[PDB]
Amino acid sequence: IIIATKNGKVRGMQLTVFGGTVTAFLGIPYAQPPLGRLRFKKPQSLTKWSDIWNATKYANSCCQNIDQSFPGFHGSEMWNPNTDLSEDCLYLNVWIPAPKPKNATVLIWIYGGGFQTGTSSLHVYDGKFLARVERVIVVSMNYRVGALGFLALPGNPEAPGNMGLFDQQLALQWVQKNIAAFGGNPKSVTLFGESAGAASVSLHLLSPGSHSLFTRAILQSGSFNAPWAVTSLYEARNRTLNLAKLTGCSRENETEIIKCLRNKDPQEILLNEAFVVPYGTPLSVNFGPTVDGDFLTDMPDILLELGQFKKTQILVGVNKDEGTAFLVYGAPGFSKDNNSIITRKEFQEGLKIFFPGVSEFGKESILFHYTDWVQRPENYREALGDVVGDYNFICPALEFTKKFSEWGNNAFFYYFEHRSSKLPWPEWMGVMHGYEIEFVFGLPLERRDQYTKAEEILSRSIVKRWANFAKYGNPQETQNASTSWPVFKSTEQKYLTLNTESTRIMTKLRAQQCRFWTSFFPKV
Numbered sequence: 001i002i003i004a005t006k007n008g009k010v011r012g013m014q015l016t017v018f019g020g021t022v023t024a025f026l027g028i029p030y031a032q033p034p035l036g037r038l039r040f041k042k043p044q045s046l047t048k049w050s051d052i053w054n055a056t057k058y059a060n061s062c063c064q065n066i067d068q069s070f071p072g073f074h075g076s077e078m079w080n081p082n083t084d085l086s087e088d089c090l091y092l093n094v095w096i097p098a099p100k101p102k103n104a105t106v107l108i109w110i111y112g113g114g115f116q117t118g119t120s121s122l123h124v125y126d127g128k129f130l131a132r133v134e135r136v137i138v139v140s141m142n143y144r145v146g147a148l149g150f151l152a153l154p155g156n157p158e159a160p161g162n163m164g165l166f167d168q169q170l171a172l173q174w175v176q177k178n179i180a181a182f183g184g185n186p187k188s189v190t191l192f193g194e195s196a197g198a199a200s201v202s203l204h205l206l207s208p209g210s211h212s213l214f215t216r217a218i219l220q221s222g223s224f225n226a227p228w229a230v231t232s233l234y235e236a237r238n239r240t241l242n243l244a245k246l247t248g249c250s251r252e253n254e255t256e257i258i259k260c261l262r263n264k265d266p267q268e269i270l271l272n273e274a275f276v277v278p279y280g281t282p283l284s285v286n287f288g289p290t291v292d293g294d295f296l297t298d299m300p301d302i303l304l305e306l307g308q309f310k311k312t313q314i315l316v317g318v319n320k321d322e323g324t325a326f327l328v329y330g331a332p333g334f335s336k337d338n339n340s341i342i343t344r345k346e347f348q349e350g351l352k353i354f355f356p357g358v359s360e361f362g363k364e365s366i367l368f369h370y371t372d373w374v375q376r377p378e379n380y381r382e383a384l385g386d387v388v389g390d391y392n393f394i395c396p397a398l399e400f401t402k403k404f405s406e407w408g409n410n411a412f413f414y415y416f417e418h419r420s421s422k423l424p425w426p427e428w429m430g431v432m433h434g435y436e437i438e439f440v441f442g443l444p445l446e447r448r449d450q451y452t453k454a455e456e457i458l459s460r461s462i463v464k465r466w467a468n469f470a471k472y473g474n475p476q477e478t479q480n481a482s483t484s485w486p487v488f489k490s491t492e493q494k495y496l497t498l499n500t501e502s503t504r505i506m507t508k509l510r511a512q513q514c515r516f517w518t519s520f521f522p523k524v
């Protein structure tokens with residue numbers, strides 16, 4: 001199993017999945033290690049190579065800080081990198097089904113992680129199941145995160161910004177020029193990602209350079225119009241200069257502020273990263289997407305409003321309890337260890353945490369809009385979750401989906417409301433952010449791993465749906481007489497709920513709450 005690519009040959013490795021085989025080329029490099037003079041620079045093309053390259057194991061993950069909040073706790077450590085962190089991390093994986101497919105649809109996954117963390121080698125991103133079951137070719141790439149992947153000094157090629165996004169782009173370009181060799185159809189590529197990954201995907205729809213690199217897109221819990229997805233021109237410069245200060249790289253010639261930075265240590269940049277913000281939040285993205293004038297040509301909010309984006313179908317969705325996950329990372333009275341029943345004062349302090357630069361009035365509004373009980377104990381605990389959830393993910397996701405449909409294309413919106421039976425976090429956190437990913441990747445199809453049977457039916461169904469969406473642009477599950485998935489139109493706004501129970505078509509998800517977040521809040 002050796003395939004010849006435009007830059008050299010690569011030796012894969014066979015795997016055994018559900019009484020069959022799947023070929024896997026883990027760790028194929030796709031760009032020039034972004035080291036030394038190349039740190040902070042757009043990914044440079046790769047130098048062709050000779051002698052069969054061995055992609056039989058995940059490569060290094062990119063440099064990034066790590067979640068040390070719950071050591072030994074699986075709930076969080078399952079997201080932490082599982083390969084050496086290195087600046088040399090521009091590698092991608094390919095999972096082609098076995099035997100070799102003739103002209104297979106490609107699914108390219110772009111992991112989330114707040115643009116600060118993440119890696120394609122996570123267990124929940126193992127694309128061998130999707131490969132095995134739908135005979136699709138899955139692709140993962142590691143893209144630089146943190147300041148090393150999103151440091152910005154607008155107009156300056158030494159550190160322009162969106163390097164992470166260009167890494168992704170370079171990887172898609174790679175699938176364009178090489179997927180054919182693996183038996184893939186470069187004319188049927190579907191980008192799918194979660195959180196900052198979904199926000200990345202949504203930006204590839206706006207980026208003129210990614211236009212021809214993919215067909216369709218799937219956005220799981222995230223869109224560029226999310227409060228956290230894009231860093232302003234100001235926030236970027238202040239933060240880039242502050243990172244300079246912390247490392248003592250303050251120069252008056254930007255270009256030098258950068259060279260002083262290329263000499264610092266990969267770790268010293270990761271260490272000071274966390275402080276470029278005065279009072280960040282559990283959802284602060286110190287260094288992320290910016291309007292560089294290259295990948296992004298104008299504030300993405302405008303491009304969207306005026307329909308300047310790749311015209312194609314999109315599958316967008318969110319989990320029922322997007323917010324909870326973050327409440328235990330700084331919200332007073334919260335713990336993954338108790339029922340975190342907080343009082344009103346605690347909710348009030350909670351808001352101070354997430355809406356830090358928000359006015360006193362603005363916080364009263366959130367409170368007022370979210371404290372209209374129907375007088376019950378877990379009222380404020382749940383109110384805080386939805387506030388964070390609705391505000392950072394759910395509403396933005398709905399606004400993006402909506403505006404995007406307004407331009408003709410078919411959009412499908414889902415609402416994942418199934419809590420994993422294996423969920424390591426407490427019950428009160430419900431259907432947590434990021435926890436639909438395993439169902440999407442068919443992990444529950446594997447009957448060992450202690451997942452209920454019903455969860456298997458669901459993962460199988462979602463996997464079918466996702467595949468059908470990639471292949472045919474319609475997320476249906478046409479055989480086992482299931483509920484049809486209607487198109488999301490700007491007026492009826494129907495979404496399909498994904499549950500183990502009875503799937504249903506409903507309308508205008510979080511109508512009342514999102515009107516507050518999408519129309520009013522932007523005003524305080």
Ligand SMILES: *[C@@H]1O[C@H](CO[C@@H]2O[C@@H](C)[C@@H](O)[C@@H](O)[C@@H]2O)[C@@H](O[C@@H]2O[C@H](CO)[C@@H](O)[C@H](O)[C@H]2NC(C)=O)[C@H](O)[C@H]1NC(C)=O
Pocket residue numbers: 235238239241242243245246275276277278
């Ligand atoms: C823009 O940056 C300034 C400077 O940030 C400070 O220095 C950085 C290296 C880093 O250590 C930050 O955490 C520091 O705050 C910010 O101004 C500071 O603001 C805080 C609180 O308002 C204050 O305690 C400091 O004295 C200020 N420093 C100076 C000299 O201005 C400023 O708030 C940043 N803009 C933003 C994002 O609001």
Ligand SMILES: *[C@@H]1O[C@H](CO[C@@H]2O[C@@H](C)[C@@H](O)[C@@H](O)[C@@H]2O)[C@@H](O[C@@H]2O[C@H](CO)[C@@H](O)[C@H](O)[C@H]2NC(C)=O)[C@H](O)[C@H]1NC(C)=O
Pocket residue numbers: 331332333334335337338339340341
């Ligand atoms: C739920 O737990 C939180 C946090 O407590 C943690 O876990 C417990 C074992 C606790 O004893 C501490 O070791 C840990 O901090 C509780 O909130 C804390 O409450 C105390 C006293 O009220 C207060 O001094 C701390 O500041 C709180 N921690 C913070 C900042 O959130 C909370 O009261 C528990 N809720 C219940 C009663 O279920």
Ligand SMILES: *[C@@H]1O[C@H](CO)[C@@H](O)[C@H](O)[C@H]1NC(C)=O
Pocket residue numbers: 011054
């Ligand atoms: C690649 O793997 C093959 C098979 O295990 C091995 O024979 C070969 O030496 C490897 N190439 C190198 C040196 O990395």
Ligand SMILES: *[C@@H]1O[C@H](CO)[C@@H](O)[C@H](O)[C@H]1NC(C)=O
Pocket residue numbers: 102103185187188
């Ligand atoms: C794959 O399908 C495309 C049309 O989408 C076609 O142009 C191409 O030749 C096919 N690839 C194969 C089977 O060689």
Ligand SMILES: *[C@@H]1O[C@H](CO)[C@@H](O)[C@H](O)[C@H]1NC(C)=O
Pocket residue numbers: 457460461464477479480
């Ligand atoms: C349809 O049901 C069969 C078993 O009766 C199951 O094996 C198959 O996966 C189901 N189809 C899907 C993709 O939901």
Ligand SMILES: [Cl-]
Pocket residue numbers: 066080
């Ligand atoms: Cl660790």
Ligand SMILES: [Cl-]
Pocket residue numbers: none
């Ligand atoms: Cl009050």
Ligand SMILES: [Cl-]
Pocket residue numbers: 481482483502503
């Ligand atoms: Cl159904």
Ligand SMILES: [Hg+2]
Pocket residue numbers: 078
């Ligand atoms: Hg897990």
Ligand SMILES: [Hg+2]
Pocket residue numbers: 417418419499500501
């Ligand atoms: Hg469920």
Ligand SMILES: [Hg+2]
Pocket residue numbers: 504505506
């Ligand atoms: Hg309903």
Ligand SMILES: [Hg+2]
Pocket residue numbers: 369516520
């Ligand atoms: Hg209102």
